[PDB]
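SEQUENCE-TO-STRUCTURE ENTRY
===========================
What this section holds: a protein sequence and its matching fold, both as plain text.
Question of interest: how does this chain fold, as expressed in C-alpha cells?
***
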Amino acid sequence: HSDGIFTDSYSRYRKQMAVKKYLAAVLGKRYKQRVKNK
C-alpha cells in the first residue's frame, strides 16, 4: 500500500515500454534487409 500507488504503476508500465523498444530494435535490423531486397 502507498498514498498514490499510481506514482509507481507508471514505472511498472515504463518497464514494459523499455522492452517494446528492444523488440523494435531487432525489427530495425530486419527493416534494412526488407528495403535493400526491394
About this structure: The two ends are 54 Å apart (CA to CA).
